[PDB]
Design a protein around this ligand. Structure first.
Ligand SMILES: O=c1cc[nH]c(=O)[nH]1
Ligand SMILES: O=c1cc[nH]c(=O)[nH]1
Lengths: 284, 282
């Protein structure tokens, strides 16, 4: 743990717009055992409302975050909900402030579940990929950080037990569900091998060779936060999984599916997860 | 220009929620010469509102329904948000520069109106970036393209920076270097994250070393903006207010209202600049 936190009289959660004096953290958050997150405030809120319906809470699902917060925060029974924007650095802001919240509240062994969207590798659009490993662009199982100007690597650890549980649950439940490797990229375009960005320094042939070699090593999708979430949670004593839908066969680059078809796909991770939460005391 | 764009019948701006078939891009965006951006949709919306009122002209979102980003236009100025962090900024950068190209816009100025941590300056200070560097203090944006390391020089429109300093309020305006970090906490040398593997002395050493090399503030996007724009034939500057003196602490202790006040200061300077240099029609 970070003993420097003892130096504070009050901790300001800058991006959630509240402080440790805003509530009794033990009282308000102490019962939390799950944290559902995704890059969209709308989507994660939508998932929270669905979970409140499943659990029988009728009162609206309201934002806990303060006025000028960057992130939203919801609570349904023993489940916390938050967004985290796009990319590893945004996700780390969420991760730091949420895990401090959990610690202050005395929450232990919490499960973080990322309900994201991604680009697939050799799988049809609509496919849910349960990550068996989050890996960087060089296919290395680490989150890279540069702390105080010095390079740090942090091993990526997926909750394989929960992942296998999810796979088994999926076998008993409108799409394909695949366990495979997941690429985490700091770019939506060039580093993910897209030819249709504003800047491109490689040919199609060079793109494909990069993608197949990734595929051959078992990669099934590509997104932008995985290495951050599955490395951080483990390091802070919690568990994490990625359950991501794919929006394209990286056959091409463009996301050509309609907005509504996309909305449909992006809810598929929530569908599987909601049942898993339902069967494992996420809700009363 | 990426020739691969010609292989597309339609180009989908996924994160803005429209496509090349949504508008006549030449007609709709052709007169744009400025793009003002920041991490907050609300702040940039309010800024666009302020500029429209200044120009004596409802500022409606051009971006689609399920979009991650907002997009507004007031006369010759585009406004958009970009979340937090280099990867999220790159998303905005790719899609907006592609939009500018489809519109036939050339040599456009990107202006990031941000918040940051100050090094050795008082909170509420405006820092005009004369360089954007990484956490290793290199004036480059690092990328990993097709699994291979690539470095891109960061170019700040220093001519515009000089003009802004001359133009310049209840605050100081400083020209200095700007660190872009891939984190708010550990990579910025904060002691108050959920994880911290260093001491106060190692923190200060990191920041003093940065300060000695001219750095005056620290944020999370600068190297992305100032490398990408130069490579796509455009110009870029950062105008960021400071919210804390990082040599004195990490926590943002100023009130929400005061933070909001500070965060509007870059717009005060830049807004007057835009009025003077045909950003809006006067
Ligand atoms: O193809 C995709 C879709 C979502 N996010 C990504 O990083 N890539
Ligand atoms: O210290 C700060 C303040 C705002 N934004 C940052 O990235 N860092």
């Amino acid at each position: 743990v970070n003993s420097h936190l003892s130096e504070l009289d009050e901790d300001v959660f800058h991006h959630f717009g509240f402080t440790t004096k805003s509530f009794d953290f033990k009282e308000k958050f102490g019962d939390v055992k799950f944290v559902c997150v995704c890059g969209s405030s709308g989507r994660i809120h939508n998932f929270a409302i669905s979970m409140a319906k499943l659990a029988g809470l009728a009162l609206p699902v309201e934002n806990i975050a303060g006025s000028h917060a960057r992130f939203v925060l919801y609570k349904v029974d023993h489940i916390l909900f938050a967004d985290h924007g796009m990319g590893i650095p945004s996700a780390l802001i969420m991760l730091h402030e949420v895990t401090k919240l959990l610690h202050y509240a005395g929450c232990k062994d919490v499960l973080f579940i990322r309900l994201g969207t991604s680009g697939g590798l050799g799988v049809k659009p609509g496919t849910i990929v349960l990550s068996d490993r989050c890996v960087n662009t060089k296919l290395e199982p680490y989150n890279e950080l540069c702390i105080l100007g010095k390079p740090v690597r942090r091993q990526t650890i997926v909750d394989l037990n929960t992942v296998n549980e999810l796979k088994k649950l999926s076998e008993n439940l409108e799409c394909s569900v695949v366990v495979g490797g997941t690429i985490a990229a700091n770019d939506f375009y060039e580093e993910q091998g897209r030819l249709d960005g504003s800047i491109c320094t490689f040919s199609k042939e060079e793109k494909l060779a990069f993608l197949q070699s990734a595929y051959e090593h078992g990669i099934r999708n590509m997104e932008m936060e995985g290495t951050a979430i599955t490395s951080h949670c483990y390091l802070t004593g919690h568990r994490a999984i990625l359950v991501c839908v794919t929006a394209v066969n990286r056959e091409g680059d463009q996301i050509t599916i309609s907005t509504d078809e996309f909305t449909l796909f992006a809810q598929r991770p929530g569908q599987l997860v909601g049942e898993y939460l339902k069967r494992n005391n996420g809700i009363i």
